[PDB]
Amino acid sequence: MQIGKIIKVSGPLVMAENMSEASIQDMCLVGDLGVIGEIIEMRQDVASIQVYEETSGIGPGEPVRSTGEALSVELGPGIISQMFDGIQRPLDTFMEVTQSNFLGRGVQLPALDHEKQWWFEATIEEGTEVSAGDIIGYVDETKIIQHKIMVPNGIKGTVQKIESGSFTIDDPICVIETEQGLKELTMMQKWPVRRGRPIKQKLNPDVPMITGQRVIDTFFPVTKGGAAAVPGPFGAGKTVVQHQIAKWSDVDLVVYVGCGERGNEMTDVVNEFPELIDPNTGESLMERTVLIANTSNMPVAAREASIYTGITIAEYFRDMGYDVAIMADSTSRWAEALREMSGRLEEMPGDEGYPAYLGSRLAEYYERSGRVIALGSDQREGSITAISAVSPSGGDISEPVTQNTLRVVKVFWGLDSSLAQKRHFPSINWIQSYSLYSTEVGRYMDQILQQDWSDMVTEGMRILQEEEQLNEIVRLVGIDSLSDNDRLTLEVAKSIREDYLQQNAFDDVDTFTSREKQFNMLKVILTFGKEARKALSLGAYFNEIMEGTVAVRERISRSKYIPEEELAKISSINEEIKETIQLIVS
Amino acid sequence: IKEYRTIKEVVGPLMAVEKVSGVKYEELIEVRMQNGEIRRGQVLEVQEDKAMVQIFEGTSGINLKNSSVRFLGHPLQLGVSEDMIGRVFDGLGRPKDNGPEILPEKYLDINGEVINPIARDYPDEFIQTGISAIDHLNTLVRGQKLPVFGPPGAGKSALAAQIARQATVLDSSDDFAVVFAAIGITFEEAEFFMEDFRQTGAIDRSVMFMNLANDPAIERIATPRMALTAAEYLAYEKGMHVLVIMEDMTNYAEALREISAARREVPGRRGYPGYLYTNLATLFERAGRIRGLKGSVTQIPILTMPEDDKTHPIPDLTGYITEGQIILTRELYKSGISPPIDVLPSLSRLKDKGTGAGKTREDHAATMNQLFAAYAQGKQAKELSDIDKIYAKFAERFENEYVNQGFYTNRTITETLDLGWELLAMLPRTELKRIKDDLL
Amino acid sequence: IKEYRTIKEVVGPLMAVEKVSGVKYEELIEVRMQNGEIRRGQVLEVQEDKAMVQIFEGTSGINLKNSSVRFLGHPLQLGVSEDMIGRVFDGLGRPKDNGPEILPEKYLDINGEVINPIARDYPDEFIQTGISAIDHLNTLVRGQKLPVFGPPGAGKSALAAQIARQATVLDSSDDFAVVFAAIGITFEEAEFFMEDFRQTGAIDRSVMFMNLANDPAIERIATPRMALTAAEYLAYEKGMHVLVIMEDMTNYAEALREISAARREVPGRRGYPGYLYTNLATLFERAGRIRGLKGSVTQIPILTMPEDDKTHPIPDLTGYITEGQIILTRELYKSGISPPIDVLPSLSRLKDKGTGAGKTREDHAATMNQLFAAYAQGKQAKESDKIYAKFAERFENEYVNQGFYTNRTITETLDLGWELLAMLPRTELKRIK
Ligand SMILES: Nc1ncnc2c1ncn2[C@@H]1O[C@H](COP(=O)(O)OP(=O)(O)O)[C@@H](O)[C@H]1O
Ligand SMILES: Nc1ncnc2c1ncn2[C@@H]1O[C@H](COP(=O)(O)OP(=O)(O)O)[C@@H](O)[C@H]1O
Ligand SMILES: [Mg+2]
Ligand SMILES: [Mg+2]
């Protein structure tokens, strides 16, 4: 209602008087164009606004109008399968409304369709006492996902009237008589982007998430609620790993955040996600995705806010009890946006010109993920799993972004360009990578598989470690230097790398390997390792074994390709292995 | 016509104008001096009834009390028409050819506008530079950003002239246009460019923006954006495939540091602006193709590297941008090689969209891979017996016949490939990786 | 005490309050926002007409004209009582246990005061941490400042929980207590510590102050002073022997640099403030014993390493203020050995005053020295000396590797060491054994 007047324009910073009623961090529409900006300072009635777009052509005398809120997200039916930018602007609706391929200045488009018709099916009886978080009804937003209309935070009371009906997200679907009065509820709630959503309680992420990626799920797995940094050079992955987890992860919803990447790196994802229909449900990936898209040339504030907007949406969905996975590609671009705005604010540098708050900002982001008991009477359980790609210039993981991320995440899948040139494209360096969840998930998998799985994981890691050490004596003094069982140790390590660790993203069977299949494929490799050592203990020679195991070992080579209906074939392998060696040993 | 006679203060290139109204940030101005001399400037700051401006040619000779400031009411703009092809402009889009006055269809903001991420298309088909080591190995696709680097005096000016005159597209009905922007080039070199462009008739395919080493630095800032605005008009509104060539963008970076220093924005990259990377990024990102539109804009920026050990912000700018690269080297320049392209480090990330069938020819990728591998090992042979006399002779014949073609002599990709086969035969016929038995 | 709607100016996290009076430097602030939310702040600077404050929770959402500020008339304090043991607080001394909230004996300036050097007592006694090579080879003394290090995700945080559970004093004439300060650690790390303490029952001898990685940085700076104030109260007023354990002081320095940048103060080395040395000094120098007073404040801070790269200010300055050092390393940790303590780089500079006859037992010094050098040559040979290298191997797997959940008696550490040197010929010393 209060109209401010521009009194100063200098580059990114506009000063507007007569704005005593606004608050710090309020968003404003600045100037005649109405370009969006953010109040960073206030001196008497004069607010200093840092604008998100270009100020070219804006000058004193023009009006400024506060939106009465901080950077916020619209949350309600119409959010899924949409493509926003960092500030939740509808990119396709840009195409439609503005009828151009460009993002004009100062043009405001509501994120969701406030005109679309949605069928609300109420599930609360009239007279029920509600507090924040309670589901009052739902809309089947997609064939897959049930959008659960919850009572907003800060509202408590009794439902006075509520009835199923076809509405807009602007029409009132419910009426709550709170202590202060009665105020209707709509299908949409707004939430500030930089403030995490309230939860009943934060929990430890102890249940492992099923990536279907063998490397990860067995050696460096991430729990539902955990955080995994993906640090690697170009071409190693980390856009395919993002994609791969978004496709096959046992998670309800996926929020894919493009942190101001190069234009073509975004064009790829923009086209490739819709045709990534995984057959677990049989509907498209976009049907369960919220996509925030930002390019290298897009507004800096949008690129900086991107991940926070995304994690706000992820929180909003796990508040319904859903499991959510948030993908950041790449957080290095996010930090470069942060550094750019810090420099333009003429702030004091920290490391490599990054702000002093870079670390705390990263901690604030990653601690908003996790396993949570959500608000509401029933005390639902949700989780946010964060997978953040980092692109350290030159692959240097000592760089501030990766070091600050590794300070708070508990999962590290370090991509290695050497393995990628070797076409070991699940480049996740088994020696350097780690997961602090590995022991807890080991106990979990021991109980729910009811096998001694973690013993196998330690044995596989042991042969890989010994492989690393024995390849040096190979390089300096030759392969002939090695013991007969040392050569066996290397060959079973080659088995685990090529038959199990390597996993093609674009083959229908290799792209996803279930828990059951993972266990059996590893088991057959390990039974090979067990039987051949006994051969050497009896006096059989390594070549004696290899000539005679060619066929069975090609069967373990094709283990990854056996479909999920016929894992009895893999179970057949290890027993066939055992019977084969006994004839060679004589 | 808005003009104020209220200059209160001038400090270096900056002027303080007062009792002002309706002036906008980065609006253009003219200082009409007390002698009648006119100087262009821009608005740095507007505060209530006041405006701080920066004068492009400097504030020498200005008398504050008897001069005035005209406020043109628009930002830096380019006049835009189909008549631009065959024309030569300066760093500000002003004509320098003594040619017929052009009536702009419209004036466009030199910054342009930013593409919707949804509407961007992949770079695809093929631009024929007429140079083998580029067209054949490091293939340029329409919508690609492919820069050429080098040390001072490595044929890069001549190479840019060659690509400007010889580049064209094969199967598109709607024809190719090339935009040429020289950044801070000495008058002798610009005049050389003009005589070459005029003799070859390549101007008829071209729009040229010439900025000279002694031109105002702010004009050096404007020139590349000028070029890209013209290219975006021709590509996305008049449907052309546009190739933008930019000489010594290192000169651009130094001019940008200069303008920043005049504005006293305490910068921290060896005196360089600090946003140097973001400025070049916004500039370099202006290439590509738009969904549903037949046009394309392609950038070939030319830059200069002093040394690989020497730490400088400008090479790191290049690190943040490259989508491939073509590298020129001094030790190789001496050798008499016409394009001094060290083939090993030069790379094109998007070569495969341009190669194929219906684009170039079937032999393209195959020939490229074998030539590169054999040339690497045969140069290392130049650095017994199994180091083939044939191999090292092939490397030197490859450098002295195949990569050296004459700055004024263009190889069609067909003729490039046919020559490739000619000399590729001088190799052990069964020492080649070739999943398609060639049988040429 | 009155409420002021005299907010004049807000720049970033800083406010300017006007028409103040009787406001003192470092005094506390309460902002009642226009929506009723309460935020606490601290005055950085105070003039006649005006005072400058920084708001801990930030200045976001504040409406200047319709908010109020109240000057609490005191600085950052700690409400202290014996009732603190068994309880877990946040960085500001507010409860996080949902427990019976405390009614304090008194409030103490968390800055504390500096001990008169005459009245300072030199450290000279033994603390049984229960880890063999700490108690034995690199022995910890009452009142000593001995820090430990670690690689990200390598068990450096498990050693703290272990040390805290097994830390005790033999004499037991007066009670031993441990103070645990968590400084910018993740919710998972803080939860690991809290539950370890609660399940082992170590909370029953412990006071815990937990500050999280996403907590405000100004609170992070406040945390160690809260902890050491509680420790000095327990030690110098109630006579307890206190062990203060600080989880990740590198995070402390990061938070300090963050506030220094927020206030636009002249940068020091690599952004870290010019007063970083003396500011760590006011923390570290709070260890020790006092003449005529039973009770000790003993400090073992834990620092994550700079990862074997170029010298960094905080290790350098800590070393300039502290004396000793201990090292934890993945090379032993991913070898499966726990605690992964590298014995050669580790050291206790004040060891000789903690261990002897009447503190541990006769056969301690010779064991320490002889086993240390024997492991040194054993590792150098390992990586007929018949089995001298295998002495290092056993020292690795049995002597060092005791288990995160095993409290070794001091005498059995000595006994295991002796039984290990049996491998070596008796031709090595002029002592009785
Ligand atoms: N898991 C995988 N399986 C098969 N190919 C892969 C895999 N990961 C990466 N690649 C190959 O690497 C190429 C590019 O990897 P990308 O994820 O784009 O790396 P970056 O994001 O670092 O550019 C892909 O086109 C693909 O061919
Ligand atoms: N052979 C050479 N060696 C070193 N520097 C040279 C040489 N020839 C010219 N230069 C310097 O480089 C400038 C021109 O180089 P450049 O702009 O890269 O174009 P080109 O590479 O076509 O000569 C000249 O003004 C001269 O100062
Ligand atoms: Mg990528
Ligand atoms: Mg030249």
Author numbering:
A (entry chain B): 1 to 586
B (entry chain E): 2 to 384, 394 to 450
C (entry chain F): 2 to 384, 395, 398 to 446
What does the primary publication say about this deposited structure?
V1 comprises a rotor composed of the D and F subunits, and a stator, a hexameric ring, composed of three A subunits and three B subunits. However, the details of their sequences and structures are different, resulting in two different interfaces between the A and B subunits in the A3B3 hexameric ring: a catalytic interface, at which the A subunit has an ATP-hydrolysis catalytic site; and a non-catalytic interface, at which the B subunit has a pseudo-active site, which has evolutionally lost the ATP-hydrolysis or even binding ability. We used computational design to restore the lost ATP-binding ability of the pseudo-active site in the B subunit of a rotary molecular motor, V1-ATPase.
Next, the nucleotide-free crystals were incubated for 5 h in the presence of ADP by gradually increasing the ADP concentration to 10 mM, and the resulting structure, A3(De)3_(ADP·Pi)1cat(ADP)2cat,2non-cat, was solved at 3.2 Å resolution. In A3(De)3_(ADP·Pi)1cat(ADP)2cat,2non-cat, each of the three catalytic sites is occupied by an ADP (one of the sites has an ADP with a possible Pi) and each of the two designed sites out of the three is occupied by an ADP. Note that, like naturally occurring P-loops, the designed P-loop grabs two phosphates. The sugar and base of ADP were found at the interface with the A subunit (cyan).
